[PDB]
Amino acid sequence: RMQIDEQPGNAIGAAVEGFDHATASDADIDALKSTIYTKKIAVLKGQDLSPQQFLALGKRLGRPEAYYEPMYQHPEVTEIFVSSNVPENGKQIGVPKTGKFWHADYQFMPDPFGITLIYPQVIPEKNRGTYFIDMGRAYDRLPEDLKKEISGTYCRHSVRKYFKIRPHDVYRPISEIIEEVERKTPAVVQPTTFTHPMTGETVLYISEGFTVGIEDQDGKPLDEELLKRLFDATGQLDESFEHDNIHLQSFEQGDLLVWDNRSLIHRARHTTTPEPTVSYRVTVHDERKLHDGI
Ligand SMILES: C[C@H](CC(=O)O)NC(=O)C(=O)O
Ligand SMILES: [Fe+2]
């Protein structure tokens, strides 16, 4: 039935053939999750699923959690995060072109989930994909001066930079929305590096989209150049996307991307044209927290 073909050596990614979430065994799920923690990306091939079946597939990997802002939610399945620029019956479903920035999912939240699932529905014919950076691999290749400078430091993550304007936000003062974002989703504090509870790797838990500051042990803020140097060194400032840390993951019809939300930061690659693009997303919590300090 299920057959996992991992990429050779330390290459990122792994293809999964003949996977049926309804008939997959417990050993198939454990082996798949083990591939996600080690190969970071698991591409399920030939997935023809309804929105209800996509949620049932995500339930096999963990406990799904719906996005906190309801305008992203699928009308039928509230646990499905919808990124869509294609109206259905003239109504806007989801939010158009999400995640066009380096980030980890729910990084700005106090308890991020460990597994992210992406099921593209409408795929533009050419320049479409998703960039990826292994922050565990990025920390290992950091310069020694940066490793010891961030030792014992903390980082603050906030969605204040890419919080999308909601339909009911029209005609409201922009400072009224800013204070609402800082009230409902205040900046969370995480250690700059944590230990992956599944693999034991040291993960540099930062992202240009969500990480807004860096502090030492006492919470005393450090110069924001330290964060900018970390973004530059890991490849999050390369607008050409030719950095060695950057991996471009494309997909065909029927692919279902399941990747490690602890180690990986990602960025949506969209066309420079108004070409239709629809993607469904399910995000689940596994048997452990983001790290053993949460
Ligand atoms: C703000 C952003 C959605 C968007 O780009 O509109 N949130 C996430 O990506 C997530 O953490 O799930
Ligand atoms: Fe995302």
PDB file of N, CA, C and O in Angstrom, residues 5-70:
ATOM      1  N   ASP A   5       9.393   6.977  -0.392  1.00  0.00           N
ATOM      2  CA  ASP A   5      10.663   7.070  -1.107  1.00  0.00           C
ATOM      3  C   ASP A   5      11.341   8.363  -0.667  1.00  0.00           C
ATOM      4  O   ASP A   5      11.025   9.444  -1.171  1.00  0.00           O
ATOM      5  N   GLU A   6      12.276   8.246   0.271  1.00  0.00           N
ATOM      6  CA  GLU A   6      12.976   9.408   0.792  1.00  0.00           C
ATOM      7  C   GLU A   6      14.081   9.847  -0.162  1.00  0.00           C
ATOM      8  O   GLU A   6      14.637   9.044  -0.916  1.00  0.00           O
ATOM      9  N   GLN A   7      14.393  11.139  -0.123  1.00  0.00           N
ATOM     10  CA  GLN A   7      15.485  11.660  -0.929  1.00  0.00           C
ATOM     11  C   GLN A   7      16.818  11.157  -0.380  1.00  0.00           C
ATOM     12  O   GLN A   7      16.977  11.022   0.837  1.00  0.00           O
ATOM     13  N   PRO A   8      17.789  10.869  -1.244  1.00  0.00           N
ATOM     14  CA  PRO A   8      19.036  10.259  -0.771  1.00  0.00           C
ATOM     15  C   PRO A   8      19.888  11.235   0.024  1.00  0.00           C
ATOM     16  O   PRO A   8      19.920  12.437  -0.247  1.00  0.00           O
ATOM     17  N   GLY A   9      20.588  10.692   1.019  1.00  0.00           N
ATOM     18  CA  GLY A   9      21.492  11.508   1.812  1.00  0.00           C
ATOM     19  C   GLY A   9      20.742  12.504   2.675  1.00  0.00           C
ATOM     20  O   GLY A   9      19.701  12.197   3.266  1.00  0.00           O
ATOM     21  N   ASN A  10      21.280  13.720   2.751  1.00  0.00           N
ATOM     22  CA  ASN A  10      20.683  14.798   3.527  1.00  0.00           C
ATOM     23  C   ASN A  10      19.812  15.715   2.676  1.00  0.00           C
ATOM     24  O   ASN A  10      19.480  16.823   3.110  1.00  0.00           O
ATOM     25  N   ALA A  11      19.444  15.282   1.475  1.00  0.00           N
ATOM     26  CA  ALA A  11      18.527  16.060   0.656  1.00  0.00           C
ATOM     27  C   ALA A  11      17.153  16.105   1.308  1.00  0.00           C
ATOM     28  O   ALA A  11      16.682  15.114   1.873  1.00  0.00           O
ATOM     29  N   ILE A  12      16.511  17.263   1.234  1.00  0.00           N
ATOM     30  CA  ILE A  12      15.217  17.457   1.875  1.00  0.00           C
ATOM     31  C   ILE A  12      14.121  16.891   0.984  1.00  0.00           C
ATOM     32  O   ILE A  12      14.207  16.942  -0.250  1.00  0.00           O
ATOM     33  N   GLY A  13      13.098  16.325   1.605  1.00  0.00           N
ATOM     34  CA  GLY A  13      11.927  15.870   0.890  1.00  0.00           C
ATOM     35  C   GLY A  13      11.810  14.354   0.880  1.00  0.00           C
ATOM     36  O   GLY A  13      12.758  13.619   1.164  1.00  0.00           O
ATOM     37  N   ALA A  14      10.606  13.892   0.549  1.00  0.00           N
ATOM     38  CA  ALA A  14      10.288  12.477   0.420  1.00  0.00           C
ATOM     39  C   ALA A  14       8.924  12.352  -0.236  1.00  0.00           C
ATOM     40  O   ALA A  14       8.000  13.093   0.107  1.00  0.00           O
ATOM     41  N   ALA A  15       8.809  11.423  -1.178  1.00  0.00           N
ATOM     42  CA  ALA A  15       7.557  11.168  -1.874  1.00  0.00           C
ATOM     43  C   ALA A  15       6.849   9.977  -1.244  1.00  0.00           C
ATOM     44  O   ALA A  15       7.493   9.017  -0.811  1.00  0.00           O
ATOM     45  N   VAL A  16       5.522  10.046  -1.192  1.00  0.00           N
ATOM     46  CA  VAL A  16       4.695   8.993  -0.611  1.00  0.00           C
ATOM     47  C   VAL A  16       3.704   8.535  -1.671  1.00  0.00           C
ATOM     48  O   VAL A  16       2.871   9.325  -2.133  1.00  0.00           O
ATOM     49  N   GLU A  17       3.789   7.265  -2.051  1.00  0.00           N
ATOM     50  CA  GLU A  17       2.920   6.689  -3.064  1.00  0.00           C
ATOM     51  C   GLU A  17       1.911   5.744  -2.425  1.00  0.00           C
ATOM     52  O   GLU A  17       2.196   5.089  -1.417  1.00  0.00           O
ATOM     53  N   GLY A  18       0.724   5.685  -3.024  1.00  0.00           N
ATOM     54  CA  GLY A  18      -0.318   4.780  -2.581  1.00  0.00           C
ATOM     55  C   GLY A  18      -0.752   4.981  -1.144  1.00  0.00           C
ATOM     56  O   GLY A  18      -0.837   4.017  -0.377  1.00  0.00           O
ATOM     57  N   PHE A  19      -1.033   6.225  -0.765  1.00  0.00           N
ATOM     58  CA  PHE A  19      -1.477   6.547   0.584  1.00  0.00           C
ATOM     59  C   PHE A  19      -2.977   6.810   0.575  1.00  0.00           C
ATOM     60  O   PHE A  19      -3.456   7.682  -0.157  1.00  0.00           O
ATOM     61  N   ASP A  20      -3.711   6.055   1.388  1.00  0.00           N
ATOM     62  CA  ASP A  20      -5.145   6.241   1.583  1.00  0.00           C
ATOM     63  C   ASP A  20      -5.382   6.442   3.073  1.00  0.00           C
ATOM     64  O   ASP A  20      -5.205   5.508   3.863  1.00  0.00           O
ATOM     65  N   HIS A  21      -5.785   7.657   3.454  1.00  0.00           N
ATOM     66  CA  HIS A  21      -5.929   7.986   4.869  1.00  0.00           C
ATOM     67  C   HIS A  21      -6.995   7.138   5.548  1.00  0.00           C
ATOM     68  O   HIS A  21      -6.916   6.897   6.758  1.00  0.00           O
ATOM     69  N   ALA A  22      -8.000   6.685   4.798  1.00  0.00           N
ATOM     70  CA  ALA A  22      -9.074   5.904   5.400  1.00  0.00           C
ATOM     71  C   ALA A  22      -8.649   4.473   5.694  1.00  0.00           C
ATOM     72  O   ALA A  22      -9.189   3.850   6.615  1.00  0.00           O
ATOM     73  N   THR A  23      -7.692   3.941   4.936  1.00  0.00           N
ATOM     74  CA  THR A  23      -7.251   2.561   5.090  1.00  0.00           C
ATOM     75  C   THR A  23      -5.801   2.452   5.543  1.00  0.00           C
ATOM     76  O   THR A  23      -5.271   1.339   5.620  1.00  0.00           O
ATOM     77  N   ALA A  24      -5.147   3.573   5.841  1.00  0.00           N
ATOM     78  CA  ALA A  24      -3.774   3.532   6.322  1.00  0.00           C
ATOM     79  C   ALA A  24      -3.723   2.970   7.737  1.00  0.00           C
ATOM     80  O   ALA A  24      -4.579   3.269   8.574  1.00  0.00           O
ATOM     81  N   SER A  25      -2.707   2.155   8.003  1.00  0.00           N
ATOM     82  CA  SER A  25      -2.560   1.506   9.296  1.00  0.00           C
ATOM     83  C   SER A  25      -1.823   2.414  10.277  1.00  0.00           C
ATOM     84  O   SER A  25      -1.320   3.482   9.924  1.00  0.00           O
ATOM     85  N   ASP A  26      -1.768   1.971  11.536  1.00  0.00           N
ATOM     86  CA  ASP A  26      -1.068   2.741  12.560  1.00  0.00           C
ATOM     87  C   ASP A  26       0.428   2.806  12.276  1.00  0.00           C
ATOM     88  O   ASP A  26       1.072   3.829  12.539  1.00  0.00           O
ATOM     89  N   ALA A  27       0.999   1.724  11.742  1.00  0.00           N
ATOM     90  CA  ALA A  27       2.411   1.742  11.379  1.00  0.00           C
ATOM     91  C   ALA A  27       2.668   2.651  10.185  1.00  0.00           C
ATOM     92  O   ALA A  27       3.752   3.234  10.075  1.00  0.00           O
ATOM     93  N   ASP A  28       1.691   2.782   9.286  1.00  0.00           N
ATOM     94  CA  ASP A  28       1.841   3.701   8.163  1.00  0.00           C
ATOM     95  C   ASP A  28       1.872   5.148   8.637  1.00  0.00           C
ATOM     96  O   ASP A  28       2.625   5.968   8.099  1.00  0.00           O
ATOM     97  N   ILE A  29       1.063   5.479   9.644  1.00  0.00           N
ATOM     98  CA  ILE A  29       1.051   6.839  10.172  1.00  0.00           C
ATOM     99  C   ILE A  29       2.335   7.123  10.942  1.00  0.00           C
ATOM    100  O   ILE A  29       2.928   8.200  10.810  1.00  0.00           O
ATOM    101  N   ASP A  30       2.785   6.163  11.755  1.00  0.00           N
ATOM    102  CA  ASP A  30       4.022   6.352  12.506  1.00  0.00           C
ATOM    103  C   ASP A  30       5.216   6.495  11.571  1.00  0.00           C
ATOM    104  O   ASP A  30       6.107   7.319  11.810  1.00  0.00           O
ATOM    105  N   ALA A  31       5.250   5.704  10.498  1.00  0.00           N
ATOM    106  CA  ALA A  31       6.343   5.815   9.538  1.00  0.00           C
ATOM    107  C   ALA A  31       6.272   7.129   8.774  1.00  0.00           C
ATOM    108  O   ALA A  31       7.307   7.735   8.474  1.00  0.00           O
ATOM    109  N   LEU A  32       5.061   7.586   8.451  1.00  0.00           N
ATOM    110  CA  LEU A  32       4.912   8.853   7.742  1.00  0.00           C
ATOM    111  C   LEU A  32       5.343  10.022   8.618  1.00  0.00           C
ATOM    112  O   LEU A  32       6.078  10.909   8.168  1.00  0.00           O
ATOM    113  N   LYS A  33       4.896  10.039   9.877  1.00  0.00           N
ATOM    114  CA  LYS A  33       5.308  11.096  10.794  1.00  0.00           C
ATOM    115  C   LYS A  33       6.814  11.072  11.016  1.00  0.00           C
ATOM    116  O   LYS A  33       7.453  12.127  11.105  1.00  0.00           O
ATOM    117  N   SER A  34       7.399   9.876  11.104  1.00  0.00           N
ATOM    118  CA  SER A  34       8.846   9.772  11.243  1.00  0.00           C
ATOM    119  C   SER A  34       9.561  10.325  10.018  1.00  0.00           C
ATOM    120  O   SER A  34      10.653  10.891  10.139  1.00  0.00           O
ATOM    121  N   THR A  35       8.960  10.180   8.835  1.00  0.00           N
ATOM    122  CA  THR A  35       9.540  10.771   7.634  1.00  0.00           C
ATOM    123  C   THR A  35       9.429  12.291   7.664  1.00  0.00           C
ATOM    124  O   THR A  35      10.335  12.996   7.207  1.00  0.00           O
ATOM    125  N   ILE A  36       8.327  12.812   8.207  1.00  0.00           N
ATOM    126  CA  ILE A  36       8.150  14.258   8.289  1.00  0.00           C
ATOM    127  C   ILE A  36       9.169  14.870   9.242  1.00  0.00           C
ATOM    128  O   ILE A  36       9.680  15.970   9.003  1.00  0.00           O
ATOM    129  N   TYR A  37       9.486  14.173  10.335  1.00  0.00           N
ATOM    130  CA  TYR A  37      10.426  14.726  11.304  1.00  0.00           C
ATOM    131  C   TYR A  37      11.863  14.661  10.802  1.00  0.00           C
ATOM    132  O   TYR A  37      12.689  15.497  11.184  1.00  0.00           O
ATOM    133  N   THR A  38      12.183  13.688   9.949  1.00  0.00           N
ATOM    134  CA  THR A  38      13.541  13.503   9.450  1.00  0.00           C
ATOM    135  C   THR A  38      13.751  14.101   8.063  1.00  0.00           C
ATOM    136  O   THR A  38      14.735  14.811   7.841  1.00  0.00           O
ATOM    137  N   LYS A  39      12.853  13.823   7.119  1.00  0.00           N
ATOM    138  CA  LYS A  39      12.955  14.373   5.773  1.00  0.00           C
ATOM    139  C   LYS A  39      12.271  15.726   5.633  1.00  0.00           C
ATOM    140  O   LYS A  39      12.306  16.310   4.544  1.00  0.00           O
ATOM    141  N   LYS A  40      11.629  16.212   6.696  1.00  0.00           N
ATOM    142  CA  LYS A  40      11.093  17.567   6.788  1.00  0.00           C
ATOM    143  C   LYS A  40       9.882  17.806   5.891  1.00  0.00           C
ATOM    144  O   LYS A  40       8.967  18.533   6.285  1.00  0.00           O
ATOM    145  N   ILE A  41       9.852  17.218   4.696  1.00  0.00           N
ATOM    146  CA  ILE A  41       8.747  17.402   3.760  1.00  0.00           C
ATOM    147  C   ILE A  41       8.301  16.037   3.255  1.00  0.00           C
ATOM    148  O   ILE A  41       9.129  15.232   2.817  1.00  0.00           O
ATOM    149  N   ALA A  42       6.994  15.782   3.311  1.00  0.00           N
ATOM    150  CA  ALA A  42       6.403  14.544   2.809  1.00  0.00           C
ATOM    151  C   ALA A  42       5.314  14.903   1.808  1.00  0.00           C
ATOM    152  O   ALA A  42       4.298  15.499   2.179  1.00  0.00           O
ATOM    153  N   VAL A  43       5.521  14.539   0.547  1.00  0.00           N
ATOM    154  CA  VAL A  43       4.604  14.873  -0.535  1.00  0.00           C
ATOM    155  C   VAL A  43       3.744  13.649  -0.824  1.00  0.00           C
ATOM    156  O   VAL A  43       4.217  12.670  -1.410  1.00  0.00           O
ATOM    157  N   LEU A  44       2.476  13.702  -0.421  1.00  0.00           N
ATOM    158  CA  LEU A  44       1.539  12.621  -0.700  1.00  0.00           C
ATOM    159  C   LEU A  44       1.071  12.723  -2.147  1.00  0.00           C
ATOM    160  O   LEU A  44       0.541  13.759  -2.562  1.00  0.00           O
ATOM    161  N   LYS A  45       1.264  11.654  -2.911  1.00  0.00           N
ATOM    162  CA  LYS A  45       0.940  11.655  -4.329  1.00  0.00           C
ATOM    163  C   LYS A  45      -0.457  11.099  -4.575  1.00  0.00           C
ATOM    164  O   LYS A  45      -0.937  10.223  -3.851  1.00  0.00           O
ATOM    165  N   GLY A  46      -1.105  11.624  -5.614  1.00  0.00           N
ATOM    166  CA  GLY A  46      -2.401  11.138  -6.048  1.00  0.00           C
ATOM    167  C   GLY A  46      -3.490  11.228  -5.000  1.00  0.00           C
ATOM    168  O   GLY A  46      -4.157  10.232  -4.705  1.00  0.00           O
ATOM    169  N   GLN A  47      -3.684  12.414  -4.432  1.00  0.00           N
ATOM    170  CA  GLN A  47      -4.693  12.634  -3.403  1.00  0.00           C
ATOM    171  C   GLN A  47      -5.887  13.346  -4.031  1.00  0.00           C
ATOM    172  O   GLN A  47      -5.793  14.520  -4.402  1.00  0.00           O
ATOM    173  N   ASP A  48      -7.001  12.632  -4.151  1.00  0.00           N
ATOM    174  CA  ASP A  48      -8.264  13.178  -4.648  1.00  0.00           C
ATOM    175  C   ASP A  48      -9.245  13.146  -3.478  1.00  0.00           C
ATOM    176  O   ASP A  48      -9.987  12.180  -3.295  1.00  0.00           O
ATOM    177  N   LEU A  49      -9.239  14.211  -2.680  1.00  0.00           N
ATOM    178  CA  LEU A  49      -9.986  14.252  -1.434  1.00  0.00           C
ATOM    179  C   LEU A  49     -10.962  15.420  -1.422  1.00  0.00           C
ATOM    180  O   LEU A  49     -10.682  16.495  -1.960  1.00  0.00           O
ATOM    181  N   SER A  50     -12.111  15.191  -0.800  1.00  0.00           N
ATOM    182  CA  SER A  50     -13.057  16.252  -0.499  1.00  0.00           C
ATOM    183  C   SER A  50     -12.556  17.043   0.703  1.00  0.00           C
ATOM    184  O   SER A  50     -11.628  16.619   1.395  1.00  0.00           O
ATOM    185  N   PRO A  51     -13.136  18.220   0.970  1.00  0.00           N
ATOM    186  CA  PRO A  51     -12.737  18.954   2.184  1.00  0.00           C
ATOM    187  C   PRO A  51     -12.916  18.147   3.457  1.00  0.00           C
ATOM    188  O   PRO A  51     -12.092  18.251   4.375  1.00  0.00           O
ATOM    189  N   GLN A  52     -13.970  17.334   3.535  1.00  0.00           N
ATOM    190  CA  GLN A  52     -14.179  16.509   4.720  1.00  0.00           C
ATOM    191  C   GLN A  52     -13.140  15.398   4.808  1.00  0.00           C
ATOM    192  O   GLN A  52     -12.699  15.039   5.906  1.00  0.00           O
ATOM    193  N   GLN A  53     -12.735  14.844   3.663  1.00  0.00           N
ATOM    194  CA  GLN A  53     -11.721  13.796   3.669  1.00  0.00           C
ATOM    195  C   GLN A  53     -10.335  14.355   3.960  1.00  0.00           C
ATOM    196  O   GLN A  53      -9.501  13.662   4.554  1.00  0.00           O
ATOM    197  N   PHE A  54     -10.067  15.597   3.548  1.00  0.00           N
ATOM    198  CA  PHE A  54      -8.783  16.217   3.858  1.00  0.00           C
ATOM    199  C   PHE A  54      -8.628  16.434   5.358  1.00  0.00           C
ATOM    200  O   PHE A  54      -7.533  16.265   5.906  1.00  0.00           O
ATOM    201  N   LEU A  55      -9.715  16.803   6.040  1.00  0.00           N
ATOM    202  CA  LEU A  55      -9.664  16.920   7.493  1.00  0.00           C
ATOM    203  C   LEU A  55      -9.460  15.559   8.146  1.00  0.00           C
ATOM    204  O   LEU A  55      -8.689  15.433   9.104  1.00  0.00           O
ATOM    205  N   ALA A  56     -10.142  14.528   7.639  1.00  0.00           N
ATOM    206  CA  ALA A  56      -9.958  13.183   8.173  1.00  0.00           C
ATOM    207  C   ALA A  56      -8.531  12.696   7.971  1.00  0.00           C
ATOM    208  O   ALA A  56      -8.012  11.936   8.796  1.00  0.00           O
ATOM    209  N   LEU A  57      -7.884  13.118   6.883  1.00  0.00           N
ATOM    210  CA  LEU A  57      -6.475  12.792   6.693  1.00  0.00           C
ATOM    211  C   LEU A  57      -5.610  13.482   7.738  1.00  0.00           C
ATOM    212  O   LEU A  57      -4.696  12.867   8.301  1.00  0.00           O
ATOM    213  N   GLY A  58      -5.882  14.760   8.013  1.00  0.00           N
ATOM    214  CA  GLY A  58      -5.133  15.466   9.036  1.00  0.00           C
ATOM    215  C   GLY A  58      -5.366  14.917  10.428  1.00  0.00           C
ATOM    216  O   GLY A  58      -4.464  14.949  11.270  1.00  0.00           O
ATOM    217  N   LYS A  59      -6.570  14.404  10.690  1.00  0.00           N
ATOM    218  CA  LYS A  59      -6.854  13.800  11.986  1.00  0.00           C
ATOM    219  C   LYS A  59      -6.023  12.550  12.230  1.00  0.00           C
ATOM    220  O   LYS A  59      -5.803  12.182  13.389  1.00  0.00           O
ATOM    221  N   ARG A  60      -5.554  11.893  11.168  1.00  0.00           N
ATOM    222  CA  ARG A  60      -4.696  10.726  11.328  1.00  0.00           C
ATOM    223  C   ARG A  60      -3.323  11.089  11.875  1.00  0.00           C
ATOM    224  O   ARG A  60      -2.656  10.229  12.457  1.00  0.00           O
ATOM    225  N   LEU A  61      -2.889  12.340  11.708  1.00  0.00           N
ATOM    226  CA  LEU A  61      -1.567  12.766  12.146  1.00  0.00           C
ATOM    227  C   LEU A  61      -1.572  13.478  13.492  1.00  0.00           C
ATOM    228  O   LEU A  61      -0.531  13.512  14.157  1.00  0.00           O
ATOM    229  N   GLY A  62      -2.699  14.042  13.903  1.00  0.00           N
ATOM    230  CA  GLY A  62      -2.753  14.729  15.177  1.00  0.00           C
ATOM    231  C   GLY A  62      -4.104  15.366  15.399  1.00  0.00           C
ATOM    232  O   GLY A  62      -5.089  15.011  14.750  1.00  0.00           O
ATOM    233  N   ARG A  63      -4.142  16.318  16.333  1.00  0.00           N
ATOM    234  CA  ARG A  63      -5.372  17.029  16.643  1.00  0.00           C
ATOM    235  C   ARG A  63      -5.404  18.336  15.868  1.00  0.00           C
ATOM    236  O   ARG A  63      -4.603  19.238  16.161  1.00  0.00           O
ATOM    237  N   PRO A  64      -6.294  18.492  14.891  1.00  0.00           N
ATOM    238  CA  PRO A  64      -6.325  19.735  14.114  1.00  0.00           C
ATOM    239  C   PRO A  64      -6.857  20.898  14.934  1.00  0.00           C
ATOM    240  O   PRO A  64      -7.656  20.728  15.858  1.00  0.00           O
ATOM    241  N   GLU A  65      -6.400  22.098  14.581  1.00  0.00           N
ATOM    242  CA  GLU A  65      -6.874  23.330  15.195  1.00  0.00           C
ATOM    243  C   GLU A  65      -7.222  24.325  14.100  1.00  0.00           C
ATOM    244  O   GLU A  65      -6.418  24.560  13.193  1.00  0.00           O
ATOM    245  N   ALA A  66      -8.416  24.903  14.184  1.00  0.00           N
ATOM    246  CA  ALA A  66      -8.855  25.879  13.200  1.00  0.00           C
ATOM    247  C   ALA A  66      -8.165  27.218  13.429  1.00  0.00           C
ATOM    248  O   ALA A  66      -7.825  27.582  14.558  1.00  0.00           O
ATOM    249  N   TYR A  67      -7.958  27.952  12.337  1.00  0.00           N
ATOM    250  CA  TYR A  67      -7.330  29.263  12.428  1.00  0.00           C
ATOM    251  C   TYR A  67      -8.200  30.207  13.250  1.00  0.00           C
ATOM    252  O   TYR A  67      -9.431  30.141  13.205  1.00  0.00           O
ATOM    253  N   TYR A  68      -7.548  31.092  14.008  1.00  0.00           N
ATOM    254  CA  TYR A  68      -8.273  31.921  14.966  1.00  0.00           C
ATOM    255  C   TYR A  68      -9.116  32.989  14.280  1.00  0.00           C
ATOM    256  O   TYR A  68     -10.131  33.422  14.838  1.00  0.00           O
ATOM    257  N   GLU A  69      -8.724  33.426  13.085  1.00  0.00           N
ATOM    258  CA  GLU A  69      -9.514  34.399  12.341  1.00  0.00           C
ATOM    259  C   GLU A  69     -10.484  33.669  11.425  1.00  0.00           C
ATOM    260  O   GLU A  69     -10.041  32.904  10.558  1.00  0.00           O
ATOM    261  N   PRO A  70     -11.795  33.872  11.571  1.00  0.00           N
ATOM    262  CA  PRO A  70     -12.754  33.037  10.831  1.00  0.00           C
ATOM    263  C   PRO A  70     -12.790  33.298   9.336  1.00  0.00           C
ATOM    264  O   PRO A  70     -13.303  32.449   8.598  1.00  0.00           O
TER     265      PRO A  70
END
